[PDB]
Design a protein around this ligand. Structure first.
Ligand SMILES: CCCCCCCCCCCCOP(=O)([O-])OCC[N+](C)(C)C
Length: 193
């Protein structure tokens, strides 16, 4: 009930989003799916950052999932993938807190050519784990009053983020973030439903 599946920090370059650090909880999935589900959440998180404007907050609905993104004006972006029922208000609180703490710890000179292997920030697995229970959300009331007056862009499908002549299938096919198993898993899941 009400799960968080991934939390990741990106540098938003044009056009490419650079993954800096990611945390996942794929334990509710079958053992054989876990590696693929992780890759697809990284792939999904990367694409949402790239198609989102700087200084904007958005929620992307797909299946029973909700992907919340905050791309800041300084080019740091955070993505949390959750179940739709998880309260969006607290998800953005989560993104606000991690991007703050990350930018305080990790100098922006490391962002444009950074990668998980070269970025030392270990806190991400802790925040995801702690936010599994919304009741233990770190309450900044000052950003809460800020978030209340903050608008969020709703995308009803992943189709909403892409261009008019763009299929999700081609981006999946050509992906460098997705392994061959992931791409297959996507292709069979498209066939079945
Ligand atoms: C918006 C993009 C987010 C990535 C979505 C990846 C989903 C891949 C589906 C893989 C097939 C599994 O089937 P399912 O019934 O979903 O089992 C999952 C049930 N739990 C949620 C409880 C674990």
């Amino acid at each position: 009930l009400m799960k968080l599946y991934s939390l990741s920090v990106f540098y938003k370059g044009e056009p490419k989003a650079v993954l800096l650090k990611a945390a996942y909880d794929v334990s509710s999935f079958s053992f054989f799916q876990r590696s693929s589900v992780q890759e697809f959440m990284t792939f999904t998180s990367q694409l949402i950052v790239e198609r989102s404007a700087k200084g904007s907050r958005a929620s992307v609905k797909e299946q029973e999932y909700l992907c919340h993104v905050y791309v800041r004006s300084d080019s740091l972006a955070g993505v949390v993938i959750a179940d739709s029922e998880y309260p969006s208000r607290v998800a953005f609180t989560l993104l606000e807190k991690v991007l703050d703490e990350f930018s305080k710890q990790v100098d922006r000179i490391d962002w444009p050519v950074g990668s998980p292997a070269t970025i030392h920030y270990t806190a991400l697995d802790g925040h995801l784990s702690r936010y599994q229970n919304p009741r233990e959300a770190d309450p900044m009331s000052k950003v809460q009053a800020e978030l209340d007056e903050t608008k969020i862009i709703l995308h009803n499908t992943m189709e909403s983020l892409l261009e008019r002549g763009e299929k999700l299938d081609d981006l999946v096919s050509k992906s460098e973030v997705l392994g061959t198993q992931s791409k297959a898993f996507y292709k069979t899941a498209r066939k079945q439903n």
